[PDB]
Design a protein around this nucleic acid. Structure first.
Length: 246
RNA sequence: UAGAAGAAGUAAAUAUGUUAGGACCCGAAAGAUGGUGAACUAUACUUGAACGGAUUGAAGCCGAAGGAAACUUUGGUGGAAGAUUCACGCAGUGUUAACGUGCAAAUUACUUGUCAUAUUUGAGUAUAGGGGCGAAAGACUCAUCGAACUAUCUAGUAGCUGGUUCCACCUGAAUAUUCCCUUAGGAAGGUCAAAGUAUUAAUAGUAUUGAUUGGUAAAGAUAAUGAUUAGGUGU
RNA sequence: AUAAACAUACUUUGAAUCGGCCAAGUCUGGUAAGCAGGACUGGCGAUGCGGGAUGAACCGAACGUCGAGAUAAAGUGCCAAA
RNA sequence: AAAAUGAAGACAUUUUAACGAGUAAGGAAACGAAAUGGCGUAAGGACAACAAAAGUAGUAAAGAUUUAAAGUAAUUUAGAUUGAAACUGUCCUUAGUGCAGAUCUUGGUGGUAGUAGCAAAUACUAAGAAGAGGAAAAAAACAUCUUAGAACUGAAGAGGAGAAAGGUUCCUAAACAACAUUACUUGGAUUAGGGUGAAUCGAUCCUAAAUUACAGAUGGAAAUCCUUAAGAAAAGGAUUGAAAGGGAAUAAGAUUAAUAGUUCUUAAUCAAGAGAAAUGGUAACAUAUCAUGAACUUUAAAAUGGAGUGUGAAAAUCUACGGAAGAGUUCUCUUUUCUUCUUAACAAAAGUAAAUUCCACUGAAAUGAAUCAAUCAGAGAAGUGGAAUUUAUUGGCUUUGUAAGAAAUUCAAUGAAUUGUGGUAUUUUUGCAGUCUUCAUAAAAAUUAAAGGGAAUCUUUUGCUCGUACUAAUAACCGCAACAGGUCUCCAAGAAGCAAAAUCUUUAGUUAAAUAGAAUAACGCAGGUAAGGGAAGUCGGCAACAUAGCUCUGUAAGUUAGCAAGAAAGAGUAGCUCUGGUGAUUAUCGAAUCAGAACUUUAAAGGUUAGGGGAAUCCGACUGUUUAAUAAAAACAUAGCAUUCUGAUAAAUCUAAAAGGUUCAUUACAGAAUGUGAUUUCUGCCCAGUGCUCUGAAUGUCAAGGUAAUGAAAUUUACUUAAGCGCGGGUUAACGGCGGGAGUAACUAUGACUCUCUUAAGGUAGCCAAAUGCCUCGUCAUCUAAUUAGUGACGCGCAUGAAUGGAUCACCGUGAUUCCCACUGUCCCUAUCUGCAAUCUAGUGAAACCACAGUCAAGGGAACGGGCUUGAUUGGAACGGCGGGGAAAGAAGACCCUGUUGAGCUUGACUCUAAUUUAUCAUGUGAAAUUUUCACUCAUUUCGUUAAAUGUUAAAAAAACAUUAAAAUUGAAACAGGCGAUUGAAAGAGAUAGACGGGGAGUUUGGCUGGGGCGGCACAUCUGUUACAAGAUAACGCAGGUGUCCAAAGAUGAACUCAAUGAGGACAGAAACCUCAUGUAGAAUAUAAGGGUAUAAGUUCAUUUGAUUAUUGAUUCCAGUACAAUCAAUAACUCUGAAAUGAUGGCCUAACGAUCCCUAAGAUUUUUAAUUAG
RNA sequence: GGGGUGUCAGAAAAGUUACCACAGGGAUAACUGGCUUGUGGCAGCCAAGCGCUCAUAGCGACGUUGCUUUUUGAUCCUUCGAUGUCGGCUCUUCCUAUCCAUUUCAAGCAGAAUUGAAAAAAGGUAUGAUUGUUCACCAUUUAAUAGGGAACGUGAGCUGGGU
RNA sequence: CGAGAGGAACCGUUGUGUCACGCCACUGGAUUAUUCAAUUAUUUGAUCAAAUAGUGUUGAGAAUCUAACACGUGUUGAAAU
């Protein structure tokens, strides 16, 4: 048959990201001595709206500690930040909302966000709206600490991985029911080309494996092995279970 | 069962037959390989352009009256909605109207619908052939799409259809049998023609006489195997 | 007994063909069929001519170009020779 | 065919006799008594006046047209005419050698046929001019130009201009052969000239989506990737990308046959050049350059959605007062109706605005201030006084310079006159202020300015390159064209009206845009009306009719409480003369809007524009999308609901590969993959089967490898190995599924109830003759006079049913169905009106189709003749209609079947394959347990930065600033052979091996057949019969049979006689066992049927293995091939019998099988060599 | 010799196309026509009986002989380089196996209403609800509301309801 | 005729329906004699007179055509069956 819609998605055609009005890459600043063995102070100049993402972005401004000028950064807002607030980033920073601390200095039970999976990689985990990761325990024997990811999974990271103390702003975004197809159309203004999704059973046998006959149905089980080739991998993949959960 | 038994073969020009090659001439739907295309249409992005008149009246706000309170009744203000309609436009529901060698290789008239946010639209730009694009009809990808266009392989193959060019003279057929992936076709064989021989235990789709073979027509039915209507005699 | 020397025996090479159809003092399946399928022979196909008004097969009889006569099937009131 | 003659005659000899039809097919050449005979086309080698000028030809070749002759024919010969330079006859040789067909190719030409047509876009007329081109017994029409009449587009135009595209189509002159469906003096047509002027408009400059280089990386290759990451490359990152984004700077008048923000006059602007460092104000802030301001850093501008309301200013229209000039009307009036009364870029500052934001004084409550709405205040309202910015250039409007000298309107014959002031009116444009809305927040750079810091100590010149004409469309672009189709924009008057609607008009444009004139038939296309009845027409109210604006009253069931709703329904509306309400300025001035009252009439929305309404059922929730060119929908989307995987070095996924690419400028409120389709109510039972999964088991089965053994070695053998499958569990909002019989309640039904077969579970809640029910037009009500229709019920429901979603409908729908009211030519049943055609004429002028053609009946025939046979009957040429025929035209039937012809799609069809997966190999160091587990980093992976303090020693009050160092190489500490982390000898890419893999590639899907399919095997095969007394022999003809069975059921010898019947014998009888008699097979013989058999071929007894080896010759199917079977002998060794004999499987007719490949048995009877003796 | 090809002189082989394509076919089906007439329709002969008596007013069993092509069968002769395939609407003609009107005979014909039969096809034979329907069934009206053919009459005559 | 219930026919007279042929007097319908009149919108300065809205529209509307809507004729005679 044809190449299904999932195959056509990996080619980088019209399915490219609609990132033209985006503000930029949101991350911590690059690690240095003044962050490893001191604290640098940042000023939250403004809080802006980055298209395509649900959380506001803070236009933080630091001072260059080795040369003359400014280090205009772009952080992800923690809930409660306000314009003109001072935020301190470093190993000796105080445990306040918005401060950037290595994950080893946070007491067990601290709620953090924008955590680095690897030291110095400028933020990976807990970046969506209203999300956060909790610190579970420390292990000074091998300099590793345990955190609980927003998916519930537990992850062990190095004790010098940085994080922002608090909650990502914009929580409760997905609790408001979209009511109209027009509203969902505007949701993907700064996203990829995915929205109007035709059911595979409404397709033809050439287009999709579900492309059916005289009655709209599937015909074969929709739970498939992980090793299925691209093209026939349509439906539920490696499904340990199905049906409504109890 | 091949051979020998006082060697016959060879060469070249023709004719006929078999075989391979374009193969008596014309004919597929297809397959592969390499290139050209988004000036039509499909979707996406960048940068521009285009809402005039009415209908209805959501929160929010203000007065009056009633109330212990919660608040309620009533009159305004406000101008929301993928709200209702008209217009410039656009589409194509009906007439299954006109036309149907047309104005037109899809148009015209009235009617109908729709007529700014899932809107309409120009330019630039991106996506290309077992690929793209698709609010999904196998739809669209330059009047070409259930796999575009163009050139080469390629005069592709065809047991199938059509055609196959001067005269006179002589001879003149076939539908049995065996085998086939065989049943619209082949090979062995029968019928036929043309060449070339042999003095030749090498004549007969006939009748007669003679010795035979057979089990058909007929015939039989307490003659064998069966089928079937009755009438006497005896126990 | 009759016939047979352009008799007889062939040898070699090869063409086309194996869709058939009709008749009947014949048969089988079928109610039956201008149906389907067979035995024997003769025909049409490959075939014109005279007759049946006309007709692939029926009847007479098979064909170089003509003249004259006797005929065959069948006919002789007119079309139409008698 | 036979005789006779026979070197040359000639006619392919002479005589006699017999014969001669023919499709497919054959008879090549030569061959004297000739093994068929000849004609024609073209070229090659010879021959052609025999006596030394040797075929024909300017005294007319070839060719063409005909007249005659010869030949059975193919053809040849000659004359005449035309033609004017080459050609012919015979013999061999050679071949691109003979045409009526191929829907044949190319070219030309007929009938149709002077036929169909030259009918959308309202429309032309008179006089004159030019011209060959309005003549004439009306030849009724006449192209271009001027004037007059009459008209249309109607200012979202048939107007004035651009982008794309076109490319000279632009202007003028000469000229009309061709072209614009007649004509043309016209033309976007022919010929020849002319025409496009920029410092200010654009391109050029910048960047957006995106695009492309050197080096690097990848690739067998072409080439691909990377775009600043990999680089000794580029303070920081290369090229291209916009005539609609950003952008230094120009206007008015005049001018040309044509160019003008481009030329001329006048008047401007811009850029690049040349000739210890200021005041004022309390403050917000202000000063014709002034009044210094480097490196470095920051801020702002360029540069930012949309809606709606209010309002400032300008312009257009309208209007008030005063006029000046011209024009129209005027025997009826009209102090009247119409036109003109204007002003640029750039600057100035008499006078004077609206809105917003700040500053100073003061301190608000009895809270005030304010808007159409809002909104605001002790982080300070209101008040008073100030400052700033915006308002199409300076500074918004009037005004001024430019500047009246221009331009407009008149007058005179170049010269003269005038060029006030307003509006609480409408529209457009351009700004401003707040309000609303987003799970949408609505570009970048070139370039410019300011700030922080304090390093250093007016005149004039020039402004280059390219585009510039014209159309921009009912004739310049794309559709074959002057095509009713398509194609992005700017400016935009009056009436009337809610309206940029319909209708009419002014400025501008045009009267031609594929020809007309006469007549006024039929049938048409477009627009209409109609008596009485009112859907009776019809599949169906299809088409048409009908309602239609505004004001007031009134408005149901149902409902998601928002709607339904313009529900439904009723009344009013004209003209004229009046009355009253709604304000501003302080009596004057002004706005369209509402209400009311007399009177009149032809009783009033209706010229134009302008909803038909109601009661139900089904589907989809809605707005939206869809098969360009027959399907617009119930289909797709949708929001909502639900499920699966993934912690980013991941999931999905593109690529041959890749420091490769997409979601991802991302991070579970995320990314990817699916089903159902709003809301309400609810989603029942089933894990057996197939999927998926497991956090799971070991010693069932499992590869290449590894190890070990024997052997001279290859080889062989044994043991051990991962995933996978198997074993066990989970999962259905995973694929899916969700029974049968019988009996029983005081009449008749029905069966609450038991019985028992059975499943993984037995269809649960619901719903129903449903868009789902065969029977079926189900049964009962209701709708109608009448109901295969609709609706409401019943439900053992062929074959309803729960996210393949079940039930439910409020609003909504160019969706499907039924019924009412109203209205009507749908109909009873047709009449009639208009325009354009059709008819005839002048000019002009095709196409489809065509074997030849064209009166009937019957017969026969290929079973439906125009032709043939027999009759009926006919006068030649035809015009307007017409739709019976020509089995009319269009198209190698698209339905069905046959091809050993395909293609799309599907699947544990066969054979493979990319992706996925598992094991082994590919040697980093240092150790411990029985190779595994450890520790490190050094290859390797994944990352981050300006490779910016690594390692080891040493010593949360404040949205503000931080840089170019003083001082004495320090100030500002040293070293490591690690830029910093992460993984790490594991993972990746390679090879080999196992699994999985319709994601993908290639191919196949027998035959016979009263069409094919389903059924059956008449396909290999035997018996009886059809079957016709030799042989052969049909049907999907009839009655049946085979794919075996047998160490005895083979061989032999001997003995015996069978089935049945009668008569006897204790139990014993109809049937037990014994005896006699009769007994032609009526028994038995493995089997289907038919044959054979009595001292047997049957039963019993006994021996036995001939059911063996080797070699020949025949018979049956037969093609006289193979296989198979049937026989006759010979040479061995044997069995049985006294022996003759018999025995090479079964009493006979069926019981079966090639090439290649695999796998067993056999080849010692004999021949050699060497060595002794002769 | 054995291992086998059963499609048995012996390929290694699953479906579906209503999206379909090509070479062909009347060697071959779906429609008319043609032969046949089982089936359908109509008509006869005999006379066991019914018809209160009476085989034949009216019927006529058990048997038996025909005709028709208006049903469906049976066949495959023509058409596969195409004969436009149902019904309805409009219109003409033809058959008689006559429904009415005309003329007659018979009856178990008293009258009226009827029933059987002969001459006769010149003239008439309707309006609607439901269904695409042919067919059917209802409600009326009429003197009667008969049955059929013409390529199952009639698509360059219409419609497009069904297929 | 019949017990009764019920219950005809021939001649004669008069009408209706349909079919066919006609016809325009009376009744009705169409009507671009854009006839006569009225009137909405636009434009002629107003009155008069018109024009435009492809026939602006409405009322009456002759002629001509026509009726299933008006009205006439086919009641008609001999012979042979």
């Amino acid at each position: 048959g044809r190449r299904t819609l999932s195959q056509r998605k990996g080619r980088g055609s019209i399915f490219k990201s609609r990132s033209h009005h985006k503000l930029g890459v949101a991350q911590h600043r690059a690690i240095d001595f003044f962050e490893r063995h001191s604290t640098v102070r940042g000023l939250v100049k403004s809080i802006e709206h980055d298209p395509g993402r649900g959380a506001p972005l803070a236009r933080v401004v630091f001072r260059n500690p080795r040369q003359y000028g400014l280090d205009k950064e772009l952080f992800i807002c923690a809930e409660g930040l306000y314009s003109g607030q001072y935020i301190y980033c470093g190993s000796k920073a105080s445990l306040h909302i918005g401060n950037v601390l290595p994950i080893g200095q946070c007491p067990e039970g601290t709620v953090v966000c924008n955590v680095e999976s690897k030291p110095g990689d400028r933020g990976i985990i807990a970046r969506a709206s209203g999300n956060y990761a909790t610190v579970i325990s420390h292990n000074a024997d091998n300099e590793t600490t345990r955190i609980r990811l927003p998916s519930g999974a537990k992850k062990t990271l190095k004790s010098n991985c940085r994080a922002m103390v608090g909650i990502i702003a914009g929580g409760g975004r997905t609790e408001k029911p979209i009511l109209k197809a027009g509203v969902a159309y505007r949701m993907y203004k700064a996203k990829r080309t995915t929205w109007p999704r035709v059911r595979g059973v409404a397709m033809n046998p050439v287009d999709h494996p579900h492309g059916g006959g005289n009655h709209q149905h599937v015909g074969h089980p929709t739970t498939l092995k992980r090793s299925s080739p691209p093209g026939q991998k349509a439906g539920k993949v490696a499904a340990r279970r199905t049906g409504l959960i109890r």
